[PDB]
mmCIF file of C-alpha atoms and ligand atoms in Angstrom:
data_model
loop_
_atom_site.group_PDB
_atom_site.id
_atom_site.type_symbol
_atom_site.label_atom_id
_atom_site.label_comp_id
_atom_site.label_asym_id
_atom_site.label_seq_id
_atom_site.Cartn_x
_atom_site.Cartn_y
_atom_site.Cartn_z
ATOM 1 C CA UNK R 1 -0.417 -8.508 -102.892
ATOM 2 C CA UNK R 2 1.198 -12.532 -102.044
ATOM 3 C CA UNK R 3 5.126 -12.183 -101.580
ATOM 4 C CA UNK R 4 6.132 -14.464 -103.907
ATOM 5 C CA UNK R 5 4.330 -12.946 -107.084
ATOM 6 C CA UNK R 6 6.532 -9.777 -106.139
ATOM 7 C CA UNK R 7 9.155 -12.174 -106.067
ATOM 8 C CA UNK R 8 7.941 -13.541 -110.009
ATOM 9 C CA UNK R 9 7.750 -9.467 -110.720
ATOM 10 C CA UNK R 10 11.648 -9.114 -110.228
ATOM 11 C CA UNK R 11 12.589 -12.001 -111.767
ATOM 12 C CA UNK R 12 10.818 -10.629 -114.682
ATOM 13 C CA UNK R 13 12.445 -7.123 -114.142
ATOM 14 C CA UNK R 14 16.237 -8.863 -113.965
ATOM 15 C CA UNK R 15 15.646 -10.643 -117.009
ATOM 16 C CA UNK R 16 14.569 -7.419 -118.838
ATOM 17 C CA UNK R 17 17.748 -5.655 -117.469
ATOM 18 C CA UNK R 18 20.150 -7.903 -118.147
ATOM 19 C CA UNK R 19 19.273 -8.886 -121.783
ATOM 20 C CA UNK R 20 18.244 -4.453 -122.426
ATOM 21 C CA UNK R 21 21.630 -3.672 -121.210
ATOM 22 C CA UNK R 22 23.414 -6.630 -122.655
ATOM 23 C CA UNK R 23 22.106 -6.390 -126.112
ATOM 24 C CA UNK R 24 21.533 -1.940 -126.181
ATOM 25 C CA UNK R 25 25.199 -1.313 -124.244
ATOM 26 C CA UNK R 26 27.177 -4.508 -125.625
ATOM 27 C CA UNK R 27 28.277 -5.821 -122.224
ATOM 28 C CA UNK R 28 28.721 -9.465 -121.278
ATOM 29 C CA UNK R 29 25.972 -11.461 -119.659
ATOM 30 C CA UNK R 30 27.951 -11.467 -115.898
ATOM 31 C CA UNK R 31 28.084 -7.681 -116.205
ATOM 32 C CA UNK R 32 24.957 -7.337 -117.483
ATOM 33 C CA UNK R 33 23.366 -8.876 -114.404
ATOM 34 C CA UNK R 34 25.443 -7.231 -112.151
ATOM 35 C CA UNK R 35 24.556 -3.581 -112.950
ATOM 36 C CA UNK R 36 21.235 -4.441 -113.279
ATOM 37 C CA UNK R 37 21.036 -5.770 -109.733
ATOM 38 C CA UNK R 38 23.289 -2.220 -108.886
ATOM 39 C CA UNK R 39 20.772 -0.032 -110.680
ATOM 40 C CA UNK R 40 17.284 -1.717 -109.485
ATOM 41 C CA UNK R 41 18.851 -1.614 -105.754
ATOM 42 C CA UNK R 42 19.892 2.044 -106.032
ATOM 43 C CA UNK R 43 23.423 1.428 -105.268
ATOM 44 C CA UNK R 44 24.821 2.337 -109.003
ATOM 45 C CA UNK R 45 28.807 2.115 -108.672
ATOM 46 C CA UNK R 46 29.281 3.525 -112.112
ATOM 47 C CA UNK R 47 31.607 1.122 -113.403
ATOM 48 C CA UNK R 48 29.326 0.418 -115.609
ATOM 49 C CA UNK R 49 26.574 2.711 -117.135
ATOM 50 C CA UNK R 50 24.689 3.132 -120.679
ATOM 51 C CA UNK R 51 26.592 5.145 -123.155
ATOM 52 C CA UNK R 52 24.267 5.377 -125.376
ATOM 53 C CA UNK R 53 21.072 7.644 -126.188
ATOM 54 C CA UNK R 54 18.834 4.281 -126.589
ATOM 55 C CA UNK R 55 21.182 2.552 -123.019
ATOM 56 C CA UNK R 56 20.132 5.874 -121.424
ATOM 57 C CA UNK R 57 16.503 5.811 -122.115
ATOM 58 C CA UNK R 58 16.608 1.718 -121.290
ATOM 59 C CA UNK R 59 17.963 2.925 -117.743
ATOM 60 C CA UNK R 60 14.857 5.339 -116.907
ATOM 61 C CA UNK R 61 12.853 2.870 -117.999
ATOM 62 C CA UNK R 62 14.643 -0.239 -115.914
ATOM 63 C CA UNK R 63 14.361 2.676 -113.334
ATOM 64 C CA UNK R 64 11.027 3.106 -112.949
ATOM 65 C CA UNK R 65 9.949 -0.510 -113.754
ATOM 66 C CA UNK R 66 12.397 -1.791 -111.267
ATOM 67 C CA UNK R 67 13.122 0.470 -107.840
ATOM 68 C CA UNK R 68 9.616 -0.576 -106.950
ATOM 69 C CA UNK R 69 9.702 -3.853 -107.521
ATOM 70 C CA UNK R 70 12.998 -4.278 -105.931
ATOM 71 C CA UNK R 71 12.131 -2.399 -102.829
ATOM 72 C CA UNK R 72 8.770 -4.347 -101.565
ATOM 73 C CA UNK R 73 10.767 -7.606 -102.745
ATOM 74 C CA UNK R 74 13.732 -7.235 -99.898
ATOM 75 C CA UNK R 75 11.070 -6.149 -97.138
ATOM 76 C CA UNK R 76 8.692 -9.262 -98.288
ATOM 77 C CA UNK R 77 11.667 -11.273 -98.126
ATOM 78 C CA UNK R 78 12.252 -9.474 -94.666
ATOM 79 C CA UNK R 79 9.179 -10.395 -93.033
ATOM 80 C CA UNK R 80 9.904 -13.255 -94.443
ATOM 81 C CA UNK R 81 12.894 -15.027 -92.840
ATOM 82 C CA UNK R 82 12.736 -12.817 -89.697
ATOM 83 C CA UNK R 83 8.994 -13.147 -88.765
ATOM 84 C CA UNK Q 1 -2.930 12.489 -102.324
ATOM 85 C CA UNK Q 2 -4.020 11.279 -105.630
ATOM 86 C CA UNK Q 3 -1.495 9.061 -107.673
ATOM 87 C CA UNK Q 4 -1.972 11.603 -110.740
ATOM 88 C CA UNK Q 5 -1.546 14.583 -108.973
ATOM 89 C CA UNK Q 6 1.711 13.139 -107.700
ATOM 90 C CA UNK Q 7 2.882 12.421 -111.046
ATOM 91 C CA UNK Q 8 2.238 15.460 -112.108
ATOM 92 C CA UNK Q 9 4.698 16.925 -109.593
ATOM 93 C CA UNK Q 10 7.404 14.025 -110.863
ATOM 94 C CA UNK Q 11 6.869 15.779 -114.177
ATOM 95 C CA UNK Q 12 7.549 19.066 -112.991
ATOM 96 C CA UNK Q 13 10.352 17.657 -111.474
ATOM 97 C CA UNK Q 14 12.387 16.393 -114.435
ATOM 98 C CA UNK Q 15 11.590 19.076 -116.329
ATOM 99 C CA UNK Q 16 13.512 21.390 -113.424
ATOM 100 C CA UNK Q 17 16.224 18.838 -113.087
ATOM 101 C CA UNK Q 18 16.615 18.344 -117.275
ATOM 102 C CA UNK Q 19 16.855 21.963 -117.631
ATOM 103 C CA UNK Q 20 18.728 23.070 -114.749
ATOM 104 C CA UNK Q 21 21.477 20.570 -115.897
ATOM 105 C CA UNK Q 22 21.326 21.278 -119.315
ATOM 106 C CA UNK Q 23 21.665 24.785 -119.394
ATOM 107 C CA UNK Q 24 24.144 25.482 -115.841
ATOM 108 C CA UNK Q 25 26.180 22.181 -116.608
ATOM 109 C CA UNK Q 26 26.045 22.490 -120.211
ATOM 110 C CA UNK Q 27 25.357 18.637 -120.807
ATOM 111 C CA UNK Q 28 23.067 17.246 -123.883
ATOM 112 C CA UNK Q 29 19.208 17.068 -123.507
ATOM 113 C CA UNK Q 30 19.646 13.426 -123.480
ATOM 114 C CA UNK Q 31 21.936 13.521 -121.390
ATOM 115 C CA UNK Q 32 20.619 16.167 -118.563
ATOM 116 C CA UNK Q 33 17.160 14.179 -118.782
ATOM 117 C CA UNK Q 34 19.215 10.933 -117.925
ATOM 118 C CA UNK Q 35 21.289 12.510 -115.472
ATOM 119 C CA UNK Q 36 18.019 13.684 -113.920
ATOM 120 C CA UNK Q 37 16.428 10.285 -113.601
ATOM 121 C CA UNK Q 38 19.541 8.419 -111.615
ATOM 122 C CA UNK Q 39 19.480 11.496 -109.660
ATOM 123 C CA UNK Q 40 16.274 11.786 -108.237
ATOM 124 C CA UNK Q 41 16.106 8.012 -108.175
ATOM 125 C CA UNK Q 42 18.959 7.585 -106.031
ATOM 126 C CA UNK Q 43 20.692 5.901 -108.408
ATOM 127 C CA UNK Q 44 23.995 8.488 -108.979
ATOM 128 C CA UNK Q 45 26.005 6.497 -111.398
ATOM 129 C CA UNK Q 46 28.529 9.722 -111.392
ATOM 130 C CA UNK Q 47 28.813 9.265 -115.333
ATOM 131 C CA UNK Q 48 27.956 12.753 -115.578
ATOM 132 C CA UNK Q 49 27.794 15.078 -112.412
ATOM 133 C CA UNK Q 50 28.032 18.631 -111.848
ATOM 134 C CA UNK Q 51 31.359 20.542 -111.910
ATOM 135 C CA UNK Q 52 30.489 24.269 -111.165
ATOM 136 C CA UNK Q 53 29.754 25.735 -107.869
ATOM 137 C CA UNK Q 54 26.092 26.226 -109.187
ATOM 138 C CA UNK Q 55 25.789 22.935 -110.630
ATOM 139 C CA UNK Q 56 26.526 21.699 -107.167
ATOM 140 C CA UNK Q 57 24.147 24.183 -105.288
ATOM 141 C CA UNK Q 58 21.251 23.133 -107.694
ATOM 142 C CA UNK Q 59 21.933 19.490 -107.591
ATOM 143 C CA UNK Q 60 21.050 19.616 -103.835
ATOM 144 C CA UNK Q 61 18.074 21.648 -104.287
ATOM 145 C CA UNK Q 62 17.126 18.737 -107.256
ATOM 146 C CA UNK Q 63 18.157 16.414 -104.622
ATOM 147 C CA UNK Q 64 15.128 18.075 -101.948
ATOM 148 C CA UNK Q 65 12.851 18.257 -104.614
ATOM 149 C CA UNK Q 66 13.163 15.010 -106.357
ATOM 150 C CA UNK Q 67 13.886 12.545 -103.892
ATOM 151 C CA UNK Q 68 10.362 11.999 -101.780
ATOM 152 C CA UNK Q 69 8.353 13.215 -104.795
ATOM 153 C CA UNK Q 70 9.970 10.358 -106.843
ATOM 154 C CA UNK Q 71 9.858 7.685 -104.145
ATOM 155 C CA UNK Q 72 6.160 8.533 -103.073
ATOM 156 C CA UNK Q 73 5.545 8.299 -107.029
ATOM 157 C CA UNK Q 74 7.202 4.814 -108.180
ATOM 158 C CA UNK Q 75 5.071 3.500 -105.112
ATOM 159 C CA UNK Q 76 2.064 5.104 -105.653
ATOM 160 C CA UNK Q 77 2.827 2.908 -109.510
ATOM 161 C CA UNK Q 78 2.926 -0.062 -107.518
ATOM 162 C CA UNK Q 79 -0.135 0.044 -106.115
ATOM 163 C CA UNK Q 80 -1.332 0.499 -109.400
ATOM 164 C CA UNK Q 81 -0.633 -1.884 -111.928
ATOM 165 C CA UNK Q 82 -0.376 -4.466 -109.308
ATOM 166 C CA UNK Q 83 -3.017 -4.409 -106.936
ATOM 167 C CA UNK L 1 8.047 13.570 -83.772
ATOM 168 C CA UNK L 2 7.789 16.916 -84.886
ATOM 169 C CA UNK L 3 8.919 17.931 -88.442
ATOM 170 C CA UNK L 4 11.054 20.765 -87.434
ATOM 171 C CA UNK L 5 12.427 18.727 -84.926
ATOM 172 C CA UNK L 6 13.352 16.888 -87.526
ATOM 173 C CA UNK L 7 14.684 19.598 -89.584
ATOM 174 C CA UNK L 8 17.019 21.098 -87.253
ATOM 175 C CA UNK L 9 18.159 17.156 -86.883
ATOM 176 C CA UNK L 10 18.779 17.290 -90.696
ATOM 177 C CA UNK L 11 20.747 20.264 -90.468
ATOM 178 C CA UNK L 12 23.056 19.426 -87.417
ATOM 179 C CA UNK L 13 23.885 16.438 -89.789
ATOM 180 C CA UNK L 14 24.643 18.715 -92.749
ATOM 181 C CA UNK L 15 27.198 21.065 -90.588
ATOM 182 C CA UNK L 16 28.375 17.572 -89.192
ATOM 183 C CA UNK L 17 29.178 15.900 -92.592
ATOM 184 C CA UNK L 18 30.764 19.084 -94.299
ATOM 185 C CA UNK L 19 32.745 20.571 -91.547
ATOM 186 C CA UNK L 20 34.130 16.817 -91.264
ATOM 187 C CA UNK L 21 35.173 16.298 -95.141
ATOM 188 C CA UNK L 22 36.201 19.703 -95.290
ATOM 189 C CA UNK L 23 38.943 18.984 -92.782
ATOM 190 C CA UNK L 24 39.664 15.080 -92.739
ATOM 191 C CA UNK L 25 39.802 15.049 -96.402
ATOM 192 C CA UNK L 26 40.861 19.059 -97.248
ATOM 193 C CA UNK L 27 38.022 19.527 -99.534
ATOM 194 C CA UNK L 28 36.432 23.253 -100.394
ATOM 195 C CA UNK L 29 33.556 24.053 -98.281
ATOM 196 C CA UNK L 30 31.089 24.122 -101.143
ATOM 197 C CA UNK L 31 32.153 20.783 -102.157
ATOM 198 C CA UNK L 32 31.827 18.868 -98.396
ATOM 199 C CA UNK L 33 28.628 20.448 -98.097
ATOM 200 C CA UNK L 34 27.617 19.145 -101.908
ATOM 201 C CA UNK L 35 28.746 15.815 -101.083
ATOM 202 C CA UNK L 36 27.169 15.683 -97.824
ATOM 203 C CA UNK L 37 24.317 15.944 -99.513
ATOM 204 C CA UNK L 38 24.980 13.303 -102.065
ATOM 205 C CA UNK L 39 25.765 11.477 -99.441
ATOM 206 C CA UNK L 40 23.031 11.356 -96.922
ATOM 207 C CA UNK L 41 20.301 11.390 -99.992
ATOM 208 C CA UNK L 42 22.553 8.216 -100.819
ATOM 209 C CA UNK L 43 23.006 9.376 -104.602
ATOM 210 C CA UNK L 44 26.956 9.192 -103.392
ATOM 211 C CA UNK L 45 27.541 10.010 -107.564
ATOM 212 C CA UNK L 46 31.540 9.154 -106.422
ATOM 213 C CA UNK L 47 33.037 12.312 -108.339
ATOM 214 C CA UNK L 48 34.278 12.965 -104.406
ATOM 215 C CA UNK L 49 34.665 10.370 -102.106
ATOM 216 C CA UNK L 50 37.384 9.995 -98.976
ATOM 217 C CA UNK L 51 40.741 8.879 -99.821
ATOM 218 C CA UNK L 52 42.010 8.756 -95.727
ATOM 219 C CA UNK L 53 41.091 5.489 -93.343
ATOM 220 C CA UNK L 54 39.775 8.472 -91.017
ATOM 221 C CA UNK L 55 37.734 9.691 -93.907
ATOM 222 C CA UNK L 56 36.730 6.397 -94.990
ATOM 223 C CA UNK L 57 35.715 5.944 -90.784
ATOM 224 C CA UNK L 58 34.102 9.141 -90.646
ATOM 225 C CA UNK L 59 32.191 8.330 -93.752
ATOM 226 C CA UNK L 60 30.144 5.626 -92.037
ATOM 227 C CA UNK L 61 29.420 7.682 -89.165
ATOM 228 C CA UNK L 62 27.676 9.768 -91.471
ATOM 229 C CA UNK L 63 26.268 7.694 -93.690
ATOM 230 C CA UNK L 64 24.311 5.886 -90.509
ATOM 231 C CA UNK L 65 23.702 9.216 -88.725
ATOM 232 C CA UNK L 66 22.273 11.325 -91.228
ATOM 233 C CA UNK L 67 20.804 8.906 -93.791
ATOM 234 C CA UNK L 68 17.633 7.984 -91.720
ATOM 235 C CA UNK L 69 17.486 11.762 -90.885
ATOM 236 C CA UNK L 70 17.350 13.057 -94.003
ATOM 237 C CA UNK L 71 14.592 10.440 -95.364
ATOM 238 C CA UNK L 72 12.220 11.401 -93.103
ATOM 239 C CA UNK L 73 12.552 14.825 -93.493
ATOM 240 C CA UNK L 74 12.076 14.734 -96.903
ATOM 241 C CA UNK L 75 9.109 12.554 -96.209
ATOM 242 C CA UNK L 76 7.457 15.538 -93.666
ATOM 243 C CA UNK L 77 8.823 17.835 -95.776
ATOM 244 C CA UNK L 78 6.614 16.181 -98.169
ATOM 245 C CA UNK L 79 3.657 15.892 -96.293
ATOM 246 C CA UNK L 80 4.160 19.302 -95.598
ATOM 247 C CA UNK L 81 3.872 21.147 -98.743
ATOM 248 C CA UNK L 82 1.299 18.634 -100.405
ATOM 249 C CA UNK L 83 -0.848 18.143 -97.712
ATOM 250 C CA UNK E 1 10.982 -7.652 -84.124
ATOM 251 C CA UNK E 2 13.465 -6.100 -81.583
ATOM 252 C CA UNK E 3 15.855 -3.281 -82.658
ATOM 253 C CA UNK E 4 18.857 -5.710 -80.989
ATOM 254 C CA UNK E 5 18.297 -8.164 -83.153
ATOM 255 C CA UNK E 6 18.278 -6.622 -86.155
ATOM 256 C CA UNK E 7 21.450 -4.771 -84.859
ATOM 257 C CA UNK E 8 22.984 -8.268 -84.339
ATOM 258 C CA UNK E 9 21.881 -8.768 -88.259
ATOM 259 C CA UNK E 10 23.243 -5.676 -89.549
ATOM 260 C CA UNK E 11 26.423 -6.853 -87.916
ATOM 261 C CA UNK E 12 26.443 -10.326 -89.330
ATOM 262 C CA UNK E 13 25.571 -8.519 -93.026
ATOM 263 C CA UNK E 14 28.690 -6.527 -91.793
ATOM 264 C CA UNK E 15 31.172 -9.502 -91.438
ATOM 265 C CA UNK E 16 30.265 -11.139 -94.045
ATOM 266 C CA UNK E 17 30.553 -8.518 -96.697
ATOM 267 C CA UNK E 18 33.872 -7.194 -95.385
ATOM 268 C CA UNK E 19 35.277 -10.510 -95.589
ATOM 269 C CA UNK E 20 34.084 -11.326 -98.642
ATOM 270 C CA UNK E 21 35.238 -8.119 -100.364
ATOM 271 C CA UNK E 22 38.600 -8.607 -98.827
ATOM 272 C CA UNK E 23 39.239 -12.112 -99.776
ATOM 273 C CA UNK E 24 37.343 -12.195 -103.402
ATOM 274 C CA UNK E 25 38.250 -8.530 -104.737
ATOM 275 C CA UNK E 26 42.117 -8.364 -102.492
ATOM 276 C CA UNK E 27 41.078 -5.028 -100.552
ATOM 277 C CA UNK E 28 42.435 -3.919 -97.387
ATOM 278 C CA UNK E 29 40.167 -4.242 -94.513
ATOM 279 C CA UNK E 30 39.504 -1.100 -94.200
ATOM 280 C CA UNK E 31 38.443 -0.729 -97.410
ATOM 281 C CA UNK E 32 36.373 -3.177 -97.411
ATOM 282 C CA UNK E 33 34.314 -2.178 -94.173
ATOM 283 C CA UNK E 34 34.001 0.861 -95.740
ATOM 284 C CA UNK E 35 32.739 -0.653 -99.163
ATOM 285 C CA UNK E 36 30.805 -2.549 -97.303
ATOM 286 C CA UNK E 37 28.920 0.253 -95.869
ATOM 287 C CA UNK E 38 28.885 1.818 -98.502
ATOM 288 C CA UNK E 39 26.796 -1.088 -100.574
ATOM 289 C CA UNK E 40 24.556 -1.475 -97.964
ATOM 290 C CA UNK E 41 23.142 1.801 -97.261
ATOM 291 C CA UNK E 42 23.354 2.167 -100.893
ATOM 292 C CA UNK E 43 25.412 4.957 -101.649
ATOM 293 C CA UNK E 44 28.118 3.047 -103.824
ATOM 294 C CA UNK E 45 30.588 5.800 -104.631
ATOM 295 C CA UNK E 46 32.125 3.283 -107.060
ATOM 296 C CA UNK E 47 35.220 4.193 -106.033
ATOM 297 C CA UNK E 48 35.801 0.558 -105.143
ATOM 298 C CA UNK E 49 33.584 -1.932 -106.564
ATOM 299 C CA UNK E 50 34.283 -5.932 -107.768
ATOM 300 C CA UNK E 51 36.139 -6.997 -110.723
ATOM 301 C CA UNK E 52 35.628 -10.331 -110.606
ATOM 302 C CA UNK E 53 32.612 -12.545 -112.188
ATOM 303 C CA UNK E 54 32.492 -13.753 -108.119
ATOM 304 C CA UNK E 55 33.038 -10.318 -107.064
ATOM 305 C CA UNK E 56 30.299 -9.716 -108.613
ATOM 306 C CA UNK E 57 27.937 -12.437 -107.676
ATOM 307 C CA UNK E 58 28.832 -11.755 -104.208
ATOM 308 C CA UNK E 59 27.870 -8.027 -104.289
ATOM 309 C CA UNK E 60 24.438 -9.009 -105.983
ATOM 310 C CA UNK E 61 24.001 -11.330 -102.449
ATOM 311 C CA UNK E 62 25.153 -8.918 -100.622
ATOM 312 C CA UNK E 63 23.084 -6.320 -101.807
ATOM 313 C CA UNK E 64 20.063 -8.562 -101.612
ATOM 314 C CA UNK E 65 20.507 -9.892 -97.549
ATOM 315 C CA UNK E 66 22.419 -6.100 -96.974
ATOM 316 C CA UNK E 67 20.105 -3.724 -98.081
ATOM 317 C CA UNK E 68 16.625 -4.061 -96.209
ATOM 318 C CA UNK E 69 18.677 -5.067 -92.793
ATOM 319 C CA UNK E 70 20.358 -1.608 -92.359
ATOM 320 C CA UNK E 71 17.280 0.306 -93.797
ATOM 321 C CA UNK E 72 15.257 -1.598 -91.077
ATOM 322 C CA UNK E 73 18.285 -0.713 -88.466
ATOM 323 C CA UNK E 74 18.702 2.816 -89.642
ATOM 324 C CA UNK E 75 14.962 3.054 -88.593
ATOM 325 C CA UNK E 76 14.857 1.524 -85.198
ATOM 326 C CA UNK E 77 17.971 3.743 -84.577
ATOM 327 C CA UNK E 78 16.165 6.675 -85.243
ATOM 328 C CA UNK E 79 12.740 5.765 -83.451
ATOM 329 C CA UNK E 80 15.237 4.680 -80.479
ATOM 330 C CA UNK E 81 17.632 7.925 -79.865
ATOM 331 C CA UNK E 82 14.446 10.214 -80.794
ATOM 332 C CA UNK E 83 11.042 8.568 -79.296
HETATM 333 K K1 K M 1 20.395 4.964 -103.233
HETATM 334 K K1 K M 2 17.602 4.721 -101.708
HETATM 335 K K1 K M 3 26.010 5.678 -106.793
HETATM 336 K K1 K M 4 23.378 5.328 -104.682
HETATM 337 K K1 K M 5 28.971 5.791 -108.309
#
């Protein structure tokens, strides 16, 4: 799979995660984007997390949609700037 | 190994983690499921975590049983929807 | 590398992490073991973490010594029980 | 890619992360270094995290620059001391 295609998939994940957290959990756009990166990179500081049952379900789908996508994107990025 | 078989292994992990946290730690079903995903994806927000020695031991076994299973499942899912 | 050898390396990491956290940070044996697994699996709930400069340095060495070791062990375990 | 080159890339990431957190977030040098390792190893205890919009953006770039770099370095280190 082309790295740029994976990059586009990661951007879609970011939009989905950001907009979802902002609207379900009510956090600002900036915090929501930050939470999304922290979640799909599997850092998970826990300074922000879902507090509603819907937010919890949404976080689970984000985790499933976002973690593999993100990992492959960083590794393809690695290859690109180094090799 | 067939991806669907791995999927079944991940579902068993989810049941084990969810039921275990609910009964050992006393959290709701919804929170327990959310905690299980957050744990085996290695996100670990720490909004929920075990507070008993048994919960701690159980979390260690879940970690060992669940993390590799989950990682292989997301990567097989990746291959499937993209390739 | 033989999986059992990797298993032995992971056990040494666990002893090192557990004893180190217990003595540097002053937490119980049980909590220290739990913290060690949570750290080297990269879950990191943050219910426990080092509070001293030495604990912080020690956690960094544990991270470096433990994360790769643990990841290879779970993946070799995966191969073993499934294949 | 030579492991030592990757090691140098990881050292640059550590400097960037440490100095960035110290100056953007105002934490000590020691805490900033500890936070950097905890972040790029994807442990993320959340005992420390950015509290400003700039700190949040910076953490996102660190995550992107640091996570793949760190993972490849630990795995190359693994090969080296074991094989
Ligand atoms: K992680
Ligand atoms: K990880
Ligand atoms: K975490
Ligand atoms: K984590
Ligand atoms: K955390």
